């Protein structure tokens, strides 16, 4: 005997992200095993925590990977890239590349800097994250009053930095720059606190290699799908 049913309003709708199965066609069909293939990653996060390389520009617009420095005085230095997980820098990077196919982010970020100069060399860099409120620093002095770390160039090749999450909101938008709205936040700067020194027989000039990552605190949530491109 038939069960009366009240057909609901929708009735012939197809939902794209609809959490529930549909009907088979080819069953009791066994799949070709795996067994022998190591290297299965279940979560994406566990990805965007592998530095990939932030490309630093020069006139030809030929960005290239190094922050590059010498003998003396900056400037307002060495660099400056903001922390707007959509920047020019971080995009192309995994974290930033992954962070994008997601609507929101939270947690602490990490910037790692590896020196590439001669071993007979020696330098000393100041590094800082300066939160939005006032403006982009325009002098180390102005910078230092922010979360930073004086990097001493020695044996130990690379430094690990990590710019927190100084955020009102428990979360932030992964970046879609219909303008710059209030939410987004960050600038990280870096300048030498003593010049980069070197004896006779060694180079003036030296390049130091850039690599973003998402810490032990990084969280991306709300899948989405960006912005149709077709590169170059």
């Amino acid at each position: 005997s038939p069960i009366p049913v009240t057909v609901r309003e929708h009735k012939g709708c197809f939902y794209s992200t609809n959490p529930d199965t549909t009907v088979p066609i080819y069953g009791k069909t066994i799949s070709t095993p795996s067994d022998y293939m190591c290297g299965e990653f279940s979560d994406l996060l566990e990805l965007c925590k592998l530095p990939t390389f932030l490309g630093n520009p020069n006139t030809n617009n030929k960005r290239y990977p190094y922050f590059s420095a010498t003998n003396s005085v900056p400037a307002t230095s060495m660099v400056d890239y903001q922390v707007a997980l959509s920047c020019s820098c971080m995009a192309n990077s995994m974290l930033a590349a992954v962070a994008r196919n997601f609507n929101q982010y939270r947690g602490s970020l990490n910037f790692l800097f590896v020196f590439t100069g001669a071993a007979m060399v020696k330098g000393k860099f100041l590094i800082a994250y300066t939160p939005p409120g006032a403006g982009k620093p325009t002098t180390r002095d102005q910078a230092m009053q922010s979360t930073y770390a004086i990097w001493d160039l020695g044996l130990n090749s690379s430094f690990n930095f990590t710019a927190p999450f100084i955020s009102p909101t428990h979360y932030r938008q992964t970046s879609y720059t219909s303008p710059t709205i209030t939410s987004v936040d960050g600038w990280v700067t870096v300048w030498q606190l003593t010049p980069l020194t070197y004896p006779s027989g060694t180079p003036t000039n030296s390049d130091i290699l850039t690599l973003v990552s998402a810490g032990d605190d990084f969280t991306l949530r709300m899948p989405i799908s960006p912005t149709k491109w077709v590169p170059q």
Partner: protein, 31 residues
């Protein structure tokens, strides 16, 4: 007494997590 205008004896098919909003409180490479 119950949610608001929401009263069927069969409550939710999907999964809470799925119908409204969770709700909350504040591999290797090798060497």
């Amino acid at each position: 007494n119950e949610s608001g205008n929401e009263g069927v004896i069969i409550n939710n098919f999907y999964s809470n997590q799925y119908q409204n909003s969770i709700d909350l409180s504040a591999l290797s490479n090798l060497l």
